[PDB]
Write a protein that binds this ligand. Sequence first.
Ligand SMILES: *C(=O)N1C[C@H](NOS(=O)(=O)O)CC[C@H]1C(N)=O
Ligand SMILES: *C(=O)N1C[C@H](NOS(=O)(=O)O)CC[C@H]1C(N)=O
Ligand SMILES: [Cl-]
Ligand SMILES: [Cl-]
Ligand SMILES: [Cl-]
Ligand SMILES: [Cl-]
Ligand code: NA
Ligand code: NA
Ligand code: NA
Ligand code: NA
Ligand code: NA
Ligand code: NA
Ligand code: NA
Ligand code: NA
Ligand code: NA
Ligand code: NA
Ligand code: NA
Ligand code: NA
Ligand code: NA
Ligand code: NA
Ligand code: NA
Ligand code: NA
Ligand code: NA
Ligand code: NA
Ligand code: NA
Ligand code: NA
Ligand code: NA
Ligand code: NA
Ligand code: NA
Ligand code: NA
Ligand code: NA
Ligand code: NA
Ligand code: NA
Ligand code: NA
Ligand code: NA
Ligand code: NA
Ligand code: NA
Ligand code: NA
Ligand code: NA
Ligand code: NA
Lengths: 275, 275
Amino acid sequence: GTDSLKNSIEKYLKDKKAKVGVAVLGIEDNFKLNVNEKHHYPMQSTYKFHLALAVLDKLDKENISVDKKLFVKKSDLQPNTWSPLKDKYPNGNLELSFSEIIKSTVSHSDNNGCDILFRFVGGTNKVHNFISKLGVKNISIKATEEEMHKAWNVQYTNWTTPDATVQLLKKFYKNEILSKNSYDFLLNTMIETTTGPKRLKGLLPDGTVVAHKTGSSDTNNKGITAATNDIGIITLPNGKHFAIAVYVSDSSEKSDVNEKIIAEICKSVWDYLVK
Amino acid sequence: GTDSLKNSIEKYLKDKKAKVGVAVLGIEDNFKLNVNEKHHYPMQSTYKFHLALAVLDKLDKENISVDKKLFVKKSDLQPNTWSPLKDKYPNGNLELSFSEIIKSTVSHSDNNGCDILFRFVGGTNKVHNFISKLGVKNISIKATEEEMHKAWNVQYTNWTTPDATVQLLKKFYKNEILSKNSYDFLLNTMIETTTGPKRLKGLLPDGTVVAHKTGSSDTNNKGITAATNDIGIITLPNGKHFAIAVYVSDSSEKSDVNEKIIAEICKSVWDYLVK
Ligand SMILES: *C(=O)N1C[C@H](NOS(=O)(=O)O)CC[C@H]1C(N)=O
Ligand SMILES: *C(=O)N1C[C@H](NOS(=O)(=O)O)CC[C@H]1C(N)=O
Ligand SMILES: [Cl-]
Ligand SMILES: [Cl-]
Ligand SMILES: [Cl-]
Ligand SMILES: [Cl-]
Ligand code: NA
Ligand code: NA
Ligand code: NA
Ligand code: NA
Ligand code: NA
Ligand code: NA
Ligand code: NA
Ligand code: NA
Ligand code: NA
Ligand code: NA
Ligand code: NA
Ligand code: NA
Ligand code: NA
Ligand code: NA
Ligand code: NA
Ligand code: NA
Ligand code: NA
Ligand code: NA
Ligand code: NA
Ligand code: NA
Ligand code: NA
Ligand code: NA
Ligand code: NA
Ligand code: NA
Ligand code: NA
Ligand code: NA
Ligand code: NA
Ligand code: NA
Ligand code: NA
Ligand code: NA
Ligand code: NA
Ligand code: NA
Ligand code: NA
Ligand code: NA
């Protein structure tokens, strides 16, 4: 049955000109599915989940309220990157709460908010170690968003296996990582995500709860899109949950196809688990 | 006097590690100042002005109302680029007016709106020719935003001299290019610009009217920022106007310094003209 679902996904992937990594882990039960999982996939913005974990842990441990505010300099809001915060606050030089910054960074994938938070938490190495020490191997966090935008290859240094991702998502969902309040906060923020609505969510019934974080790369001069990703936890019609991570990497396919790969793989998994 | 202002600007630029092109043209009088003007500077987002001219001309000539709507596909709203439209409409697949698209493209520098409009108007070559046929030489329009994001060098194909820019801005301000309504619309849209508030506007008195369009590049792995630009028309305290264009190119300086170069050069010009 699980083997059959796997074979269906593998057959779907046969004519897609991309390297697609898939992992699924049940939250409450023992369901497990991996496809192409031993490869290293570039995370792009999906690593803002990991960053948010480390940030909220730091706030939890050091007794810093999420309503406390950072001073966000104009130079912290750089122009040549995706940034709803910057368009909201074009002059910068203002106090913003950790709450507001994290919500933008995670739900709207702000790149400036990401790097502001890397600086707050003490750098990429802090977050890399934090994750490693949760007992999840096969995740590498090396470069900030600014660093990734400087050169095409730098994104591949921020890599993961897909099964690492869902292991981490399951530790998180069972609230094994954060305080209750920080867990509630991050989970709500992941359900509130507005990006990628035609990825994991794309072909699921209207109103399905999907707590998720997307990531995307650009396309290079050879027509390759390095990363089109979506990771999250999905609620089934009976209240149970599954963690799923899909990484469409090094793809020669157009963006509509890359998103559809995620949506169709997710639908296949959903259809199996509801049945 | 004008020669003295020039010498002041040249002296300011002596210790700045960037190639800075400057042009100023009075709108109503004969004032003219050029610095480093024979070089070719990468325009980045400043070419959305030129695009808007060609678009509004097309709408004017073909009797198409600016309130008419394009269908903006989800694939027209690409994720790895600066785009307030995309964050506003994450599902895309909706009807948006030319008005709304142009306001986002010009006032908020949306990159997706830019490329949607390049497609509407018939491509970069259409806009290149349109501009050339206004009688303004030394502007090259070759690449869309998507094309620029594929490779570092592509931005240099969209180049200008600074004096070309202010020649064009003056033709525009005197409403020699568009209908009255389209002129009014584009001018209002340029005053409504929210980007770059610490560039041309940075050191001018609060409330000074500055109709402008900014542009920025990223920084490469060698620490060079190709472009930090601002172009526009400024209203003096006595109602007269000047067109100014500043291109801080191939800069080893940090972003705060690059912006400050524009702000300080503009202030110098402002101080001269008010006196
Ligand atoms: C993250 O991968 N990025 C930030 C932003 N969001 O895109 S997302 O919708 O897939 O998370 C733009 C794309 C990408 C990047 N290029 O920085
Ligand atoms: C234009 O140069 N771009 C679009 C957007 N706006 O920046 S602006 O404020 O200088 O016009 C982001 C930067 C840039 C680009 N990299 O596309
Ligand atoms: Cl980006
Ligand atoms: Cl947790
Ligand atoms: Cl961009
Ligand atoms: Cl005009
Ligand atoms: Na594959
Ligand atoms: Na389960
Ligand atoms: Na693995
Ligand atoms: Na800002
Ligand atoms: Na706030
Ligand atoms: Na605030
Ligand atoms: Na937000
Ligand atoms: Na560190
Ligand atoms: Na690191
Ligand atoms: Na790890
Ligand atoms: Na990269
Ligand atoms: Na693993
Ligand atoms: Na969501
Ligand atoms: Na979503
Ligand atoms: Na989507
Ligand atoms: Na992508
Ligand atoms: Na591609
Ligand atoms: Na110079
Ligand atoms: Na004048
Ligand atoms: Na010249
Ligand atoms: Na969209
Ligand atoms: Na509209
Ligand atoms: Na509309
Ligand atoms: Na707008
Ligand atoms: Na053309
Ligand atoms: Na062209
Ligand atoms: Na020309
Ligand atoms: Na470029
Ligand atoms: Na010229
Ligand atoms: Na303005
Ligand atoms: Na402004
Ligand atoms: Na600014
Ligand atoms: Na710049
Ligand atoms: Na620089």
